[PDB]
Amino acid sequence: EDNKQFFGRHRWVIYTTEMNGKNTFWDVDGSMVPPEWHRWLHCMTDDP
Amino acid sequence: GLLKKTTGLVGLAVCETPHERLKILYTKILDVLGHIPKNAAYRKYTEQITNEKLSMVKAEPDVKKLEERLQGGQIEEVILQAENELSLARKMIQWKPWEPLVEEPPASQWKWPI
Amino acid sequence: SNLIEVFVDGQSVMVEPGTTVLQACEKVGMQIPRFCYHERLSVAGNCRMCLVEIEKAPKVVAACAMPVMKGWNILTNSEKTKKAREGVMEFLLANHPLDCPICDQGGECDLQDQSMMFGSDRSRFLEGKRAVEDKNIGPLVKTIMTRCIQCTRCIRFASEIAGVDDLGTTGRGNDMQVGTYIEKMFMSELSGNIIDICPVGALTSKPYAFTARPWETRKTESIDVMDAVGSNIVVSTRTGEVMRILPRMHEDINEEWISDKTR
Amino acid sequence: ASATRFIQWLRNWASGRDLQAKLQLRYQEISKRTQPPPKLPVGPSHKLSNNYYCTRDGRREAMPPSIVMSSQEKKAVSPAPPIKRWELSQDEPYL
Amino acid sequence: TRPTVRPRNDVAHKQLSAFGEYVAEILPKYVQQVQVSCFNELEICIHPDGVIPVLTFLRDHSNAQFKSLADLTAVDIPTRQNRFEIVYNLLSLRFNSRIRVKTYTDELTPIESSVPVYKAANWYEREIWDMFGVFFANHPDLRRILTDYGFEGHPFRKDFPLSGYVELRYDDEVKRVVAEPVELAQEFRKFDLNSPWEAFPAYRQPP
Amino acid sequence: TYKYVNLREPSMDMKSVTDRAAQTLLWTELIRGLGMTLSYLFREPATINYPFEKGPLSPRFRGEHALRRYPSGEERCIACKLCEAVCPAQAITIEAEPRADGSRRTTRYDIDMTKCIYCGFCQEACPVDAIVEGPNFEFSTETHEELLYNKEKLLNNGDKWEAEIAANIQADYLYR
Amino acid sequence: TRDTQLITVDEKLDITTITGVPEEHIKTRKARIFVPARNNMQSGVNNTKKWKMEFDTRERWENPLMGWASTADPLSNLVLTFSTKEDAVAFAEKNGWSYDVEERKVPKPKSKSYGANFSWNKRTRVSTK
Amino acid sequence: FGVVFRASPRQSDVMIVAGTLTNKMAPALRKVYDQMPEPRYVVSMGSCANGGGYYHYSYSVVRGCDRIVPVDIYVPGCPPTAEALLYGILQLQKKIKREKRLRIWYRR
Amino acid sequence: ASTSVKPIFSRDMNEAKRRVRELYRAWYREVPNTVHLFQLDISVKQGRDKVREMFKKNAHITDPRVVDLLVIKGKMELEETIKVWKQRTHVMRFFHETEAPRPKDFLSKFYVGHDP
Amino acid sequence: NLTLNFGPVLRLVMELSGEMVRKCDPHIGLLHRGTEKLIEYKTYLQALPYFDRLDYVSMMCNEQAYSLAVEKLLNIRPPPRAQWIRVLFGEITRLLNHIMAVTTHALDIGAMTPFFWMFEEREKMFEFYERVSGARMHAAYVRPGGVHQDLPLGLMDDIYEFSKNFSLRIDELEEMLTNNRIWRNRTVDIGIVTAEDALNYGFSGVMLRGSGIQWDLRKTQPYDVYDQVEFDVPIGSRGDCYDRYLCRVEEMRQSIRIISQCLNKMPPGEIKVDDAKVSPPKRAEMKTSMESLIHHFKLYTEGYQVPPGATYTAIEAPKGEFGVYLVSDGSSRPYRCKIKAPGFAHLAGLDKMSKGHMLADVVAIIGTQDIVFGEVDR
Amino acid sequence: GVRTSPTGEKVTHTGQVYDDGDYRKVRFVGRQKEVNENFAIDLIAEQPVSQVGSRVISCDGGGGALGHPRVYINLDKETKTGTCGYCGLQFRQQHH
Ligand code: SF4
Ligand code: SF4
Ligand code: SF4
Ligand code: SF4
Ligand code: SF4
Ligand code: FES
Ligand SMILES: [K+]
Ligand SMILES: [Zn+2]
């Protein structure tokens, strides 16, 4: 989080390098965000 | 008054003698209406409105004041309409709308809902 | 030669003596709202949804039971008639359950449709509703009796059409209930017809329960072959499957009834 | 907003306008993404009395078209009065 | 007032009624019926022979000046013997009013092209031809405008199936898009929604 | 009221004619355009760093359809077919029967996600908040058949996205 | 008194060749011109006013992928509404469809009397009210 | 990402069918596909190109562009958000990354 | 009377039949050009046979107005072919090269399905 | 002459004599989907999303035209707050369409940079759509009787923040186009339409105001609450592409002017007509009241019956006069829904406007007509 | 409560499973059959019966406006529990 950045770039996720037994070091996907964080990451809410 | 530079409508040129142009057209419409039967509604209604507009042209020299009296926009728009009325009256003579209805509709032609 | 002259909204209509206000309105194409009246049962006059204003008469009359008199003007769309329909509809829906989405009658319910056409559009009932115990009257007719509006069609049909005097009303007042009192099954060769006449979802077809909605079915008009009467039916199908069998009116064969086998 | 004063002057001068007053990027002047719960009002027909539907029924006040003429001295008329001429804007008559 | 009901405009209902009689008197040879709806819309129903006379009068007459053709379309009512209803929507910027002109025809009877009156009717008439199969005589260039080349049938007719009769597909054997009889994996589900109870007694038809 | 956009007469005094001559010969107005794009070179770009940054959405966002449950695990859907009757694209297919315990439940609940127009009418019409459109918008597939959801896929979505669907409904149920 | 010059055409109206319909769906089909029967679940009679024309039902099979109902019949969903029997037969004849016309079934007028529920001697007396 | 805004069809590597494919337009779309130099991929964007969408039951709509051309990625939505389409392009990139053209050639 | 009706172009069959032949000659002379421009895989003779077959199916018409429409539509079809508004796919839709023949005998129908 | 078949969704079959255009013949129908025939199979609520997808750059102005037509037949009136929301998002939509019209027109004739500046503004306006409806484009938010839901708390403050800066964004667009001689060379004296030709060819919108005709349905035949807002109608003088470009850019400035007044004059109240036989009740009362559940059930399965009748209702959509001729038979499904797309009459006049011009001018003329083939073909 | 057929395929909560000789099983070769593991009929049986002290109880599913339409359940019959028609919860009357 960085609230000095403009809206849209003020929240981001650095994806894990391994999820569900898949190597995601270079292969990252937007669907890897779990639903609880999906809401906070897309600014549907202010409370993580 | 000083002649306007433009009418504001593209393709509609400014007329330098509006009063004389309208007197001719209105007097020419009345002449064509004389060939229509007296009882025809088009004769009675077109002569009535034409005379009122012609009365205003002869009764007011100022163009700006004439335009407000006629309520037809720019005077060049009044002239154009008088040309459309004149071409209409000539065509009505060939159509002869004042005659009885050509044919009746079927029994339920204009019934809604079905 | 004995026809009398009555008016319906000013239109003159000639009616045989003994004709009711409801019937006279049906000769000009107007269908008075009704819940308890069925033209093949005896008159009951207890739902009060047919109340209509007779011009110059202070009191509204039950159109289903009032024989029309000479020179009456039947105001089927006056303010007095329309306010009488909303009051009666308001009372019918006061204790009715919020069951439409789980109720098999939804989409072909006379309580729904007449509420949309003649009733109000909201509620002022701020109390708790009535709940009623269910009765098991066999394997063919499912009974959710909290949906019953106490119209007594089933009682009259069983008593008059089917000849079985097993249905009736036990109790009194708001707690009056339709049923058999004792644990008994309404097993008759014409029992399944009480599903159709019942205007609400109180009586529904147990085999047909939950399988389809009325708007999605295709209706094919055909004949019954289970016997030699030749009853006219409508076969409801959806997506190439047969869903239910309904009667079809033929005045000379089966009226609007069919037997349990046919159904 | 993170641009230094020098680059701010350069962008401002090249454009000719003070860009820092009206930035196209949204910083913390927009509404919070979690707002307090609302409580919306009810309409004019939410009443417990004097609210019969036959008195506020728009659909049943619609009528079939009026037949002014059918096949089954007087002054000439127009569909409506002539349209009033428009008035030049007092805000910015000429762009 | 009554917040949920559309307010009437009796002034505009009076004016349109007067102009309807005006038009009916000036063109008795064609006008068959004039009516004003409860929301103040004037309809002039005419014999199809009057398409050019009636439209020309409304376009040119000093008290009409209906110089815009807003729309021109057709409605298919199969129960009438003249199943098609040709509708003209005209606009008058001088008097800030609209008028609707209706006529009729069948599958074979031509209608006169109103291109000489309104140039905007060039494409509207082609769309009517393409979608309903109504032939407009003396049209400068009459041909399909919306349907695929070689399309058979007129889709907007009430008896034309919603999904048509043919569907396209690429065949690898012949290396081109081909047309074949339509087969839907899921048939369109026909819903019967009409309530069996009358909604509007003011429109009840006589028995 | 109205205004004229292009009804001004250029001045013919010698200074104004020379001001226009300088513009033509010295390309002055073409050089303002260069200044306006040099300005944008030194503005921060509006690009976000997808997929590590996401575009903002709201609780009303209409995404992948999903079937929900009560807090007890019982399905909310009671096979009423109001969603099926209102779907403008006719994308919902429902079949139902009495469940083993007498309950009113669907045996089929399919949504053709290639017919669906993602309009949300179904979740408007459902009286029990069973079918909803979740917040997911990243479910692109490699075959056409993966977009024909059946009751298992939709129930799986509900179990998969309930934690976020429930909070989106809690944030917006008072506007509906 | 039309000015347009008319011509005489003495043949039954027939438009089968200018409708675009495949020949398979003009000769093999069977129109049914009827007044829909009242839905026996409701007492409303507002769907029994107009005449309908529908066509003969054909095969619907189960879609292998999803179990959906498939069809190869373009006229399966086609229903037309007509004011009268005659103008419904007229439409069928000019389109070339063979048809069956079923006469309207109107309920017989009934003799209803509330007082009969309390008869002195007759059998119409009711046991419960 | 390296995805130029708009390339000419003869320089193009992927075709995005974004909208309703009507019968009148179907042969034109096939011709453009046949003229794409290989390797060529197709992305079906939206419900109209996926399966006809809102106009599935129309007489003049191809029920899915996958009756005319082969499709590699289907992007659902009406319309898919610009981010959903981007998620589908990044999925096509991941799909190219899994190709084994030389392994198949080697093991032939 | 009832049988009085506006003509489209032709006031009787004799005048209508003239327009049919004028259309046939226009179509007959464009098959070689159509088979060349569109690079069709059919011969000119079978292209002219299809023209003949189309003129033959609706050869029982006796209403002059129906004939005029069939000619109006036929000219529209010819114009699309000559102007090359059509493509190779549209010209070949007259030949139904991709759908297997539907047998017309009763027994063959009886085995395959319920249709008559 | 040389015949060029500029295939594709537009197919232009032009007849060129050297570099001049002697005849332009637009071939359309490449996006004809049978919308009007599909609407006949839908209830009135089910046919609403079909109108987002006609002029798919002005989505919420198409819904308003349909809603005004059904409301006219229904004889109901949407509540005052619903009308201010419909005039607020009508002008936000007009900004969306005019950005797509000017910048795509500029991109066609070479100027590619203003497209990217303004499509960031479109991205922020797509968020207003998504915060009231949940969809960025096809909101299906304006409905017969009002709007679906009420504005969420915090939206109007976000609309204000966007509107403060938007004039500066238009000024940057004008620094690239208005005085640029290359742009003036591509647009000035190109595609001139006389005021009398424009009326007879069925033109509407800036295709008339560009020729000096003083007509705007928002002021001559006002709908909703346009009679309570103050704005100016930009009028051209030469009838050419350049004057039409200046009318569109000036209309964006007036749209911001109207948006400023909607935000201040937004009233309280409900957002859909308080008549549960037309507009569904709130979910809270659908789950407690018997009447409400009945009316919810029937409004979402059968729909509301509309009295028999026929209306031609029109609005001043950003492209021009958008209207519908809607025929009701008394049932819950429309009998006929003819859609009057303004571009259909405009594109029909491309042949006239292209006479005496070169091939590269046809690209500028199509841009100045603001053609979207969702509405041309329907 | 996912049961497995003799061939090995999971039975869905609707009772669906392909027979042994059905060719449509070929769609799952190299892929999987998606079966929801949480059977609703089993989870609503785990909920305890609620003891109330009145003849008529009302259920709205819990959550107020977030539940289901409010219905009233009659508990006069002592040989069975009163089940909610929307959500399956059961109620019983205390010692009567
Ligand atoms: S009987 Fe009718 S009103 Fe009562 S719950 Fe069933 S559908 Fe609803
Ligand atoms: S069960 Fe049905 S038929 Fe019997 S009284 Fe109740 S509502 Fe009437
Ligand atoms: S969102 Fe719209 S299209 Fe999708 S399933 Fe729901 S109602 Fe149907
Ligand atoms: S999802 Fe909702 S609307 Fe659809 S059938 Fe289930 S309960 Fe009814
Ligand atoms: S946005 Fe929706 S309706 Fe429009 S083209 Fe895409 S899928 Fe079709
Ligand atoms: S129908 Fe008359 S009281 Fe029931
Ligand atoms: K029942
Ligand atoms: Zn419950």
Swiss-Prot record, chain B:
It is a peripheral membrane protein. The modification N6-acetyllysine is found at K28, K44, K58, K96. It is found in: Mitochondrion inner membrane. The modification Phosphoserine is found at S87. InterPro entries: NDUFA5. GO terms for cellular component: mitochondrial inner membrane; mitochondrion; respiratory chain complex I. The keyword Phosphoprotein applies. The modification N6-succinyllysine is found at K96. The keyword Phosphoprotein applies. Its main location: mitochondrion. GO terms for biological process: respiratory electron transport chain. Keywords: Acetylation, Electron transport, Membrane, Mitochondrion, Mitochondrion inner membrane, Phosphoprotein, Respiratory chain, Transport. Accessory subunit of the mitochondrial membrane respiratory chain NADH dehydrogenase (Complex I), that is believed not to be involved in catalysis. Complex I functions in the transfer of electrons from NADH to the respiratory chain. The immediate electron acceptor for the enzyme is believed to be ubiquinone. Belongs to the complex I NDUFA5 subunit family. Complex I is composed of 45 different subunits. This is NADH dehydrogenase [ubiquinone] 1 alpha subcomplex subunit 5. The gene is NDUFA5.
Curated annotation (Swiss-Prot), chain C:
Residues 217-263 form the 4Fe-4S Mo/W bis-MGD-type domain. One of its GO terms (biological process) is mitochondrial electron transport, NADH to ubiquinone. The modification N6-acetyllysine is found at K56. The keyword Nucleotidyltransferase does not apply. [4Fe-4S] cluster 2 binds at C148, C151, C154, C198. [4Fe-4S] cluster 1 binds at H96, C100, C103, C109. Residues 80-119 form the 4Fe-4S His(Cys)3-ligated-type domain. Keywords: 2Fe-2S, 4Fe-4S, Acetylation, Electron transport, Iron, Iron-sulfur, Membrane, Metal-binding, Mitochondrion, Mitochondrion inner membrane, NAD, Oxidoreductase, Respiratory chain, Transit peptide, Translocase, Transport, Ubiquinone. [2Fe-2S] cluster binds at C36, C47, C50, C64. GO terms for cellular component: mitochondrial inner membrane; mitochondrial intermembrane space; mitochondrion; respiratory chain complex I. Its main location: mitochondrion. It comes from the Eukaryota. One of its GO terms (molecular function) is metal ion binding. It is found in: Mitochondrion inner membrane. Residues 2-80 form the 2Fe-2S ferredoxin-type domain. Core subunit of respiratory chain NADH dehydrogenase (Complex I) which is composed of 45 different subunits. This is the largest subunit of complex I and it is a component of the iron-sulfur (IP) fragment of the enzyme. Complex I associates with ubiquinol-cytochrome reductase complex (Complex III) to form supercomplexes. Interacts with MDM2 and AKAP1. Belongs to the complex I 75 kDa subunit family. This is NADH-ubiquinone oxidoreductase 75 kDa subunit, mitochondrial. It comes from Bos taurus (Bovine). The gene is NDUFS1. The chain holds residues 29 to 291 of 727 of the full protein.
UniProtKB/Swiss-Prot annotation, chain H:
It comes from the Eukaryota. It catalyses: a ubiquinone + NADH + 5 H(+)(in) = a ubiquinol + NAD(+) + 4 H(+)(out). Belongs to the complex I 20 kDa subunit family. The modification Hydroxyarginine is found at R6. Core subunit of respiratory chain NADH dehydrogenase (Complex I) which is composed of 45 different subunits. This is a component of the iron-sulfur (IP) fragment of the enzyme. Its main location: mitochondrion. Its cofactor is [4Fe-4S] cluster. This is NADH dehydrogenase [ubiquinone] iron-sulfur protein 7, mitochondrial. It is an enzyme of class 7 (translocase). GO terms for molecular function: 4 iron, 4 sulfur cluster binding; metal ion binding; NADH dehydrogenase (ubiquinone) activity; quinone binding. The chain holds residues 109 to 216 of 216 of the full protein. One of its GO terms (biological process) is mitochondrial electron transport, NADH to ubiquinone. Binds 1 [4Fe-4S] cluster. Hydroxylated ar Arg-6 by NDUFAF5 early in the pathway of assembly of complex I, before the formation of the juncture between peripheral and membrane arms. The gene is NDUFS7. It is a peripheral membrane protein. GO terms for cellular component: mitochondrial inner membrane; respiratory chain complex I. Its EC number is 7.1.1.2. It is found in: Mitochondrion inner membrane. Core subunit of the mitochondrial membrane respiratory chain NADH dehydrogenase (Complex I) which catalyzes electron transfer from NADH through the respiratory chain, using ubiquinone as an electron acceptor. Essential for the catalytic activity of complex I. [4Fe-4S] cluster binds at C48, C78.
UniProtKB/Swiss-Prot annotation, chain K:
GO terms for cellular component: mitochondrial inner membrane; mitochondrion; respiratory chain complex I. Keywords: Electron transport, Membrane, Mitochondrion, Mitochondrion inner membrane, Respiratory chain, Transit peptide, Transport. It is a peripheral membrane protein. The keyword Mitochondrion applies. GO terms for biological process: mitochondrial electron transport, NADH to ubiquinone. The keyword Membrane applies. Its main location: mitochondrion. It is found in: Mitochondrion inner membrane. Accessory subunit of the mitochondrial membrane respiratory chain NADH dehydrogenase (Complex I), that is believed not to be involved in catalysis. Complex I functions in the transfer of electrons from NADH to the respiratory chain. The immediate electron acceptor for the enzyme is believed to be ubiquinone. Belongs to the complex I NDUFS6 subunit family. Mammalian complex I is composed of 45 different subunits. This is a component of the iron-sulfur (IP) fragment of the enzyme. This is NADH dehydrogenase [ubiquinone] iron-sulfur protein 6, mitochondrial. It comes from Bos taurus. The chain holds residues 29 to 124 of 124 of the full protein.
